[model samples]
Target: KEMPQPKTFGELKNLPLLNTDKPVQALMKIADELGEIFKFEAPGRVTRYLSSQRLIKEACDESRFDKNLSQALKFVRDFAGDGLGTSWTHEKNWKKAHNILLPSFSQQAMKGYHAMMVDIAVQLVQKWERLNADEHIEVPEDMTRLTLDTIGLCGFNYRFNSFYRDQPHPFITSMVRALDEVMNKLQRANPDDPAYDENKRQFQEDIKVMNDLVDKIIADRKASGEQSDDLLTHMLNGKDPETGEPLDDENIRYQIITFLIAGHEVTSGLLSFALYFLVKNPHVLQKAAEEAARVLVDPVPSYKQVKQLKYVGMVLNEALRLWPTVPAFSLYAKEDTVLGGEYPLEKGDELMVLIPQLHRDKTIWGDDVEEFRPERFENPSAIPQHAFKPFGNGQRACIGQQFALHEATLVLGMMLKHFDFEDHTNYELDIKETLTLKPEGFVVKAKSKKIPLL
Candidate 1:
C-alpha cells in the first residue's frame, strides 16, 4: 500500500478527541480514526500507531517490539534507580541483573508471599469496613494503597500500613511527587522556563525521600537477618550462578525500587480498572462473585487454588483486554517491513502499539468486541496468542505477572465474598495516565457483603 498521508494538527482537530486533555484518551480516539497504520506529525516529531493485532503479533514475535527508542522513560531511571535505567537502556549488565533477579519473581518464589498478600489485602478491606455507610473511596488511589502495601510487606518484609494512615503515607507522597515532577517535565512546553529549576529541585527532594526510605529498609534488614524468603532478602543474599557473587546493596536497592514502584503501580491500575468494569457491568460482577464464592470458601485461597478460579481469571483477562494499564508503547523497527501486511516501516523507525484498540479489533474479537464479556476468555479458542496480550508475551513479558495475578484474583475473590462494591455516580471510565493508564477520580463505596445487593 502507498504511504498514508500524515495527519496534521489541523486535520486531527476535526475529531473532537484531539481536543481532550488526556493524552492516552486522545490517542485511543485517533487510532480509531487512522486505522491500523497511520502517522501523526507534530512540530518536532512524528509517531506511527500500529493497531492491527496480526502486525503487533509479528512485531512482538520477531522481537522488534522490545526495541528501546524513547528517552522519556529515563525519568524512571533517575527517580527509581540504576536497575530501571539498565533495563530500559538495555545496558550490558541488564542481562546479568535480569538473570540474577529472575528467581525472585518466579512462581515458586511468589508462593512465599501468598499469606502476606492476604494479610495486606485484609488491612485494606478492614479500612473499607470502617468507612461510614454510603461514603465512597477513591478506587484507583485506594487500590494503589493495597498494591503498595503488598509490595512493601510481601516483597521487602516491610510495612507501609498504607490504609492505616488518615493522611497520605510518606512513601506514597514521595512516589507521587517524583512522578508528578517527571510528568511535568514531559508535558512542559518550554525547557528554559524558570519553574523547571524548582521542579528539578523538588524532584530531587522527592527522590531523596524515597531513596532514604529504601535505605532505612536496607539498614533494618542488615541489622536483623530476615528469616522469611521475601524478595529483598533473596536479592540481598542470592548468588549469581555464573560469577557466584552476591548482589551488592546498591543493586539490591535498585531492584527493590524497580519492583516496588513500577510493578505495584501497574498492578493497582489493573485492579482499579477491573473493579471499574465489575461495578459498571453488574451481571458480570455477579457471575464473577459467584465464581469467587465457589472457589474461595476459605476467604483466602491457596496459590494453586487462586490460579484455578476460572471465571474470575476470565474477568481479569477481559478487563485487561478492555482497559490495559499500558495503552500505547513505543518500540523501534529492526528492518524495512510491511506492518500488518499494509503500511511500510523502515529499520530504526519507531512504532507505537495501540494495545487497547488492538484488543477491541472486530476482525479478531468479533463485532461485539467493545462489549464487556469475560466469557470470551472461558472458551478455549477465544483469541490467538499475541491477540490477547495485556502483560505482553514472550521473554520480555511481565516477570511478576503471576504474582500480580494471584494477588489480584485472590483479592477480587475475597472482595466479592466479603464486601459489596457500590457506585452511585454516572460511573464512567475517564481514562488518564501519568506513568500508567488509570481511571480519573474513580471512587466507590465498599459495603458489607452481609446485606446482598438486590
Candidate 2:
C-alpha cells in the first residue's frame, strides 16, 4: 500500500521537522492533513509515523514488532547507557535491571515511599503558602522541583530540599542540560560543524556531573550500611530472579540515573498539565477538589487513603490523554511483515507511534475528543485493546508506570486540598520539548485554602 508523502516547502523534507516554532503543533497539523499514517524520507533514513487507532493497533502486535530505540531514543543511549529505557531488545542487562527493579515499584514499596512523597508535597504547599495570592507561580518549574526532590529522597535517601533553594540542585541542572543536549543533537544533526564539538564537550561534562552524583549516592548508601528498603538498597542487595546474580556496579549506576531520568520530569509534566486542565475547566476542578477533600481527611494522605482517590486518578488519565508528557515511542519489525494487512515493511523498518495524534482519534474518543473529560476513564475495561497507551506499549512499557501515577495522584490531591489555583493569563497550551513535552511558560496564581495541622 502507498503512503502519503507531504511535499516539503523548505530545506527539511517535513514541516514537523522544520517547524521548530511549534514542533508538536506542526506535527499534529501534518497528522490532520495525512490522516492515518505518513512517511518521511531523509538521506539514508525512512520513518513511518503511525497516527490512527487501526495503524497503532497493528504496529503494537508483539508478534511482528518490538520496541526500537530509534532516532531520539537512540540518542538517549549516550545519556542512559544500557539502562532499561534505552537498552536494545538483545541486551542482557535490560532484563536483569527490569527483574531486579520490578519489586521496588510494588504496592508494598509504594507504601514505603508514601511518607517521602508526602514530605516533598508538604514542601511544595509551604512554598506556595509563602507566595502572595497576586503572585503568579510558574507551574512546571515548581512541579519539576517537587518530582526531583521526591525521586531523590525516595529512590535513595538523598534530599534535594528543592524548595529551600533558589535554583534546582546541581545534579538536576546537569542531568537536564545533558538530556537537553541529547534532544538538540537529535533535532540538528550536524556532526562536522565546530559548534557540534562544543555541544558534545558540554554534554559529556554534564554526564560526568550526573555520574558523580549517582556514584556518591551509591557510595554513601554502602558506607552508611543502613540496608534500607529504597531503590538504592534494592539494586545493592537484590538479585535477578532468574539468574540469581546482582547487578554489576557499572549497571547499578546506570539504573539509578535511569530512575531519575525516567521518573522526575515526566511526572512533573503530568502534574503541570493536569493543573492547567483543572484551572481551565472549573467544573472538573470543583469535582477533583471535592474528591481530594473527601479522600484526604488528614494533612497528608496515607498509603491506603491515596489508593482511595479514584476521581483524582481519572483526572490524571484525562491529562495524559491530552498531553502525554513523553509523546511517542518507536517500534520495529525483526522480519518482513505486512502492517494493517496492507503495507509491506522490511526487516528493521522502524515505526513511530505518535501518541498525540492517536489520542485525538475522533472515532475512538468520539467527536468531543478535544474536550477535557475525565469520565472516559471511569470504566477502564471499556477502552479498546491498544487504544490508550500513554505510558507505552508491551513488556518495554514504563517500569515506573504505577510509580508515576501514585506520585502524581498524591501530589495533586495535596495541592487540590491546600490551594485554589487562579489562571490570570487564560493561557493557550504551547508545548516545550525536551526528551519530554511540557506546557511552556504556563503560570498560575495559587491562594492558600487552609493549612492543615501536621
Candidate 3:
C-alpha cells in the first residue's frame, strides 16, 4: 500500500479524516505539510483542554481531590470516583481514552477485560453453532455492544445489559447517537454559525443524562453498602493514606466517566482493527493463531500468559501503528517555545501531531511503512520511545496503553484460539476520524476452528 502525501495544508485538510468537525484537523494538516513540528495560533481556550498534560493532570487531580485518596492509590482508585466516573462515561468512553486511566492500571484492568472478551467469544461461538456451517457468519454491530457491556461489568462493576436485550438501551443509543451528531455538526459549523449553540446545548443535555445515570449507580452502591473488587468500589471507598478523607462525588464522577470511556472504547477499536487486519492478511492471521495455540494453553489467559504471546503482541502493535484509534494529537502552547528548531510557537498556539502520518513516515518507520509487519515490534525495545507511540508521548501519554494492549492481545488470542475470521466481501471498511479513528460500520465474517471447546 502506498501512503498519500499532501504538500499543502489545503491538500491535507481535503483528506477525509482531517476534514471532520474537530479543529484538530486544521492543525493536523499544518503538522503534516510543515513537517511534524509546526506552531498553530488559535484561541488559547480553543485548544487548552486538548493539552495532553492538562487533561491527564486534571483527571488525576479530580480523582485525588474528589475521591480523597492517598497519593499512592489516587491513580488506581480515584479514577473510579463519581465525577471521574461521569467523565469516563460521557467524554472518555464516548469521545476518547487517554483522558482517564494511566498505563499501569489500564493493563491491570485488562485482567478483567479478557473476562469480558471470553463472554463475547462464547456468545459468538454459540450464535455460530446455531447457524449452518456452510452459511457465512456475519459480524454484527452487537459484537461491539457486547464488548462494551462486558467492559462495564468487568472493568467498572456496572451492568449495562447492552447486548443481553433484543434492543439497544435508550441510554446507550442516545449517548452514541448524540456524540456522532455533535461531532458532525461541529465539523460542518463555521466559527460564526449559530448551530454551535444548539449543538452544544444538546451535547450538554445528553452528557447530563449519562452522568445522572452514573451518579445514581454510585449512590445505589453507597446506599446498599455493596463492596466488590471492581474499579468503582475501590474509588468510592478508597482513602488517602495521609488525609483519611474520601473522594468527593464531583471529582469521583469525572474519573468514573473517564474510565468507562477509556476502558471500553479503545479496546473496542482495537478489536475491530485487529479483526480487520487479520482477515485482510491471511498469512498474519495464521501466524497469530499459531502463536495463540503455542502460548495460551488455558481457555483464559492470565497476565503472565498475555505477556508471553510475543507474536500476537507484535501483530497488534502493527495494527495499532497502521490504524491507531487516536491517529492525531494536539497540544496547546502554554508558553512561547521552540519546537523542531524551525517552528517558533507563541502562547495559545496549538501544536498538533498526526500519528497516522508519522507512523507512515518513511524516514521514521522505514520503507515498509504501509505494510503490516509485526516483526517491526518483535524486539519491542528496538522501537524508539517516542517514535512508535500509538498512545501518545511524554508525561501525558495514555495511562491505559498497557490496558489497551493487554486487552487487544487477550481478545485477539482468545478469538483466534476458537475461530478463524475472514473479511466479508460485502463491505469494505470506511474509516472515520472522530476523537478516535473508527471503522464507519465495521462488519466481518468468521468460522469456528475444529479445536475442542474451552
Candidate 4:
C-alpha cells in the first residue's frame, strides 16, 4: 500500500501543492522531486497523485477505479448540483442527463449547431474587423466572448451577445464571481470569522443571480413553446432511452447551468492557449494557416470540411498537451484494489491525475517534450492512449469533448483563414486559474487578410 512520499511530516509541510494558485507548476515541481507516483498524507485524508504514462494507464482502468469529484468540484455542487459535470458517480441524474444528452453531441447534432457556431464566430471576426490595425486584442477575453456566445446560441438558443455588450451578461458575471469564489473559498476552513460570513454573503448572492437567470432562461423556453434542435429542447422534451423518463424541471435547470459552466470556459481556454502558442511559434502558425487555407475553401467551413482540418486538430492536441485547461481530474477505486497492482487502495481513497505532467512526461514525449510540435499528434497512436488525455478518462470523461473540439477547431480555422496573429506585448506564458486554466494577460494583434467573397 505504501507509495513514494515525503520523508516526514515536516517534509510534507514543504510540499508545493499547498500553493493552489499555481497548481500546475506546483505539481510539475512535485513530480520532479517525487518521481512518477507519489502520495501526500494529511491529518484525516490522504491525497495521491499520479504522473508518467505507465502509472496513469494502470490507474485509468474503469474496472478498478472510477471518477471522484475533487474537493473543488465538490464545492461546485452548490450551484452545479447534480449536473453532469459535477455530479457524483452514484447520482441518478448524472446517468439520466448523460443518456439524454449524449446524442445531442453526435456528429449529426453538431451539424445542426454548425451554422450557429459560424454565426458566433463571425461575430468575433466582425468585432476584430472593426478594430484598428494597431489595436491589441485580449486573447482570453475575446475567445471567452466567442465561446460563451457560441454555446449560448448553439446549446440553448440563447445569446450572451457578449461581443456587443460593454460588460459580460449577468449570467456570466455572476457565474464568474461564483466560480472564482469556489476556488478562493476552497482553501479556507474557518467559518466563524466575520470575513468568512462576508465572503459567504457575496458567494450566495452570485449563486442566486445565476440561478435566477437560468430559471428565466428555462421559463422563457417553455413560454416560447418552439421546437428547436438546441440542447435546452432536448433536456425539456427528450427522454432517457434507458428509462424513458423526461428530466424534471429542477434537474433541467442544473443541466442548463452545467452546460453553460462546463461548456464555454474550457474551450475558450483551449482557443486562447492555442493562439498564444501559434503566435509564439511562427512556423507552427504558418503550417496551421496553410491547413486552414487548404481546407476552408469556403467563407465558413461545412460540417464535413471541419473534420478535414486535421493539421489544425494536431495544433489543438499539442496545445492541450502543454496547457490542459482543466489541468487535473480525480479518481478513486470502485472497490478495494491496488494501483499498478502495487499501491494498495481502499474505497474512498482519492487519487488526482495531473494531465499536464502526464502529457509532458519526458520518458514518453522524449527530450523535446516541452516543445510546441503539433506533429507529435500527427500519429496519435505513436503516443500511449492514456498519456494524452486532455479531456479526461473513462466513462466519466467530458461529455462535451467532441463538441468543445469541434467548436474550437472551427473558430481557430476561421480565425486563421481571415487573420494573422502578432504577439502584442512580447508576452511570456503566464497561467490564470479559476475553475479552469487560461493564459494571463495574453494579448495579440489580428491583422486582417484579404477575404475572398464566397
Candidate 5:
C-alpha cells in the first residue's frame, strides 16, 4: 500500500485533493480518509472540509457560506450574472427583499402550482403512453427534460415542449450545455485565461434568445393589459424599489434561466436516483408500489394526495441520503473562531461540508449505513440536527425543500402507480460526477403496471 505523506496545514490545503476520474465513491473516500474539519483549498483559496456535526453546528452560518458560494460561483460561462447572483443579491438585500420573496417560495405560494405540476406529469404520462412497453430511457436525461419543461411553462409562463419535441428547444440546448460549461469553468486549471470569453460569447447569444422569449411574453401581457398570476408575475412584482430600475430584461432572463437550471435539476436528479435505487432494491420497490396503490388511488393526485404516501417519502429520503445531489458545498468564516474546539479558523477560512460522509456515518445511522433501508427515515426526530442534511441545513438550506419534495413525490406517485422501472441488465449505475452525483448509465425499461387504480 502507498504510505501517507507528512504535511503542514498549508501544504495539505494546496495539495491536489479530489480524484475526479472516480468521483462518486472517490468523494466518500476523501471524506473518510481525512478526518472531520480538515482544511483544504479549491484552486486558489483556503477551505475547510467538515465531516463533524458539532463543528458544522457550532461554527457555521449562512452569511459566510452564502458569500463563499456566490464568490466562488458568481458568474455562468460568459454571462454577467448567474442564478447564484440571485442568491448573492438575496443575501445582500435580505432585509429589503426577504419578506417579499418569502411568500413566493412558501408552502402556500407553491400550492398555486398544483394544477400545472400534475398536468405536466399527465403530459409525460401521455407521452409515455405512446412509447411501447419495455422501451428503455436514460432516467436522468428524461427527468431533466421534464423538469425543464415544468419550469418553463410554470415558472416563466413559457413552454419548451421538451417531452414532445423531436429536438430540444434552443433554451434547453444552451442551459444543458452551460451546466457542463460552468462545471468545466469551476474545475479548469486556469481561470485567468480567456476561458470565460467564449462562454460569455455564447451566453450573450443565448440571452438574446431568452430575452426574446421572455420579454415578448411580458410585453404581450402589458400590451393586452392582461395580468395572470404565475411565478414570473410574482418575480416581476417583487422588484428592487431601491433602484428606480425594476429588474431589466437580462436580469429577468438570468433568474429564469437560473430557476430552470438550478431549481429543477436537483429535483430531477433526486427522482432519477430514487428510481435507480428502487430498481436496485426490488423489495423497496414493492413497498413503494404498495404505498402508491394504497395512497395514490387517484394516480394523478393533487398536492395533498401525494403527501399521504409516507413510504414513498421515506424511499426518496433514503435516496437523498445515500446519493445526495450536491455532495460537498462550502461556507466561509466571517470572524476568527475555533472549530469543534480544535482547529483555529480565521475569517475567510472556508468550511466545506462533506454531506456524503455525514450521511453515511455509522454512528448516526447505525451499522447498516450502506444498506438501502427506507424505514430509517420513519422517525427523523431521533436523528441529530446536523446529521442528515440531504437538502442542506439551516436558514439558507434549500429554498425548494418543500417544492422538491412535493414535485418528486407527485411524479413518483404517478410513476409507481402506473409504471415499473425494471433494470434490464442487473447492471449497477455507473454514476457520473461533474457537479452533482449524476445518474449516468442506469438504463431501465418501463413496463406498465396496468393495475386498475384511479
Candidate 6:
C-alpha cells in the first residue's frame, strides 16, 4: 500500500524515520525500509553543522576557493571515502570537500574546462562533416561527449580521453559500478536489521578500489616530484590559513570523489535538459543564440565574456527551477525545530525540502510559476531566495554550484555561437530520479550556423 503524502514539515517529521548514526548495515536497513523519507542524523551536531556551513561558504567564495589544476584533479579523484570511517556527508569530510571541489570554478579550472570544450568542438565539427549531407541527423553524441570530457578535466584533472579513446576506462566503469552497488544495498536493507555489516563490507571494498587508484596517482607524483596544475597538487601542498597544515592524502581523496560525482552527474543532466528545453522552445533558443553571438565575437569566450551571456544563464536557471538536480534536500532535525509557521520538527525527525515543488510554488514564484520565463530574473529583486534553489540553499547547498554554472555557460554559449540548433526528430525525455534528477539518454541534432569568423 502506498503511504499517505506528507503536506507539512510537522506531518513529515511525525512519520517513522531511521537514524543514520548507526553502523552502515543498520543504516542501509533503515534506508530500505524508509525509502526516500528516512531521517539522517549525524552523531556530532556541532561538527556537522559547522562543516556544512563552511563547505557551502567555500564553494560560493571565489577568492579563497580557487586551486591550481593538479590540486583540482586530486580533489575530484579522492573526494569519496575516508578509509571506510567517514561518509561523504560527514563533518570530517568538509575541509577536504570544500578545499578541493570548490576550486574547480576558479580561473584556472575554468581554463581546463574550456580547453576540453574546444577539443570536443573540433571533433564534433569533423564528425558532422562526415555524415551524409542529405540524411537527417538524430542525436548529438559529440555534444554529450564534450560535456562528459569536460567533467573529467574540470573535476578530476584526469583525462578520460573520451573524444578519441576507443573504450571507456576501467576505473571509470568500476567507480560507477561501485556507486550503483552502494545505492542498491541502501535500497535493500531493512531499518531494524542487524545484517548491515556484510553490506557495508562489500560497499567498502568497492570504495577501496577507487581509493587505491587515487593513491597510486598521488604516490607517483610524490615519488617523481612532479608538480601538476590539477586539483591533487593544490590540496597536497595547500595550507589552512589558521593551522598552516597541508591537506592529507585521505582528505584530498574525499574532495576529489565529491567533485567527480557532482561535476559529472549534475552537469550531464543539465546539458541534456538544456538541450531538451532548447528544442522545445525554439524562440528561446533563438534569443539565446543571438545573445551568444553578440557576446562572444571570438571562437572562445573569456571569463568576463561569459557574464555578458546573461540570457543563457537565465534559461539555465529556468531549467533548474523546473527540474532541480536534487528535487529535495533531506535533513534530519538534531533537535525539535520550528519552521514555516506551524510545522514543528521533533528531535530525530526527518525533513525533505521539496525544491521543485517550492520552486514552482504559487505563493513564492507567482501565478506563472510553471511557465519557462528567463525574463523573470532580469529583475533580480523579483526573485526570492527560498523559492529558487538549483544548487540548494543554506549550509548544505552544493559546493560545486558556481563551477557547474560557469562550465554550463561556456559549453552552451559556444554551442549556440557555432550551431543553429533545430529539432530534427520528435523525442520525449524520460526522467530518472537518482541522487539527482537526470534525463534518460536520448539524441539531439543541430546544423552549423557557419557564422563567419571575426
Top-scoring candidate (TM-score): 2
Q: Is candidate 2 or candidate 5 better by lDDT?
A: 2
**lDDT tens digits, residue span 1-454, model 3:** 1122333334223334334444344544554455433322222212211212212232232221121111112222222333332222233232222232332265555665566656655565566555565566434354456556755765557766654566756556545655455446433414347856776676567677767877787888888887766666766666554345555666656666665656455557767776777777889889989989888787566778878888888888888888777665444455565443333546655434456655666655778777887888877677644566577655455655675676567767777887777565646877655545556666655677766656
Q: Give TM-scores for every candidate, taking all chains together and pairing residue i with residue i.
A: 0.89, 0.96, 0.76, 0.95, 0.86, 0.74
For all candidates in order, the CA lDDT equals 0.74, 0.85, 0.57, 0.84, 0.67, 0.56
Model 3 lDDT-worst window of ten:
63-72
- Against the correct fold, how does model 2 do in TM-score? 0.96
**Candidate 2, overall lDDT?**
0.85
Q: Which of candidates 5 and 6 reaches a greater lDDT?
A: 5
Residue 159's lDDT in candidate 2: 85
lDDT of 5 by residue, 1-454 (tens): 1112213335334343442454546646756776564555554565566676666666445554444563225545244253332354344443334334456667786678777778777776666656775577778877777777676666766767777666877666666566666665555555557957887677567656755765676676557754455666765677655543345455555556656665556668888989888988999999999888888766468677876889999998899888888676656677777665557767776666778777877768888988899998888788777787776666556666777777788888888888877789786777777656667876778877675434
Off by over 4 Å in 4: 6-20, 189-192, 452-454
Better of 1 and 4 by TM-score: 4
Q: Supply the TM-score for candidate 3.
A: 0.76
Poorest 10 consecutive residues by lDDT, candidate 2? 10-19
Best by lDDT: 2
Off by over 4 Å in 1: 2-20, 41-46, 63-65, 84-90, 451-454
Q: Deviation in angstroms for 167 in model 6?
A: 3.8
Which runs of model 3 end up more than 4 angstroms from their true locations? 1-34, 37-117, 134-143, 191-201, 241-245, 424-427
Clashes of 1: 0
Q: Is candidate 2 or candidate 4 better by TM-score?
A: 2
Candidate 6 accuracy as TM-score = 0.74
Residue 417, candidate 6: how far off, in angstroms?
A: 1.6
Error of 3 at 325 (Å): 0.7
lDDT tens per residue, model 4, 44-142: 457788988888997788888889888788888889888888887788888888899999988778889999998888888888888985888998988
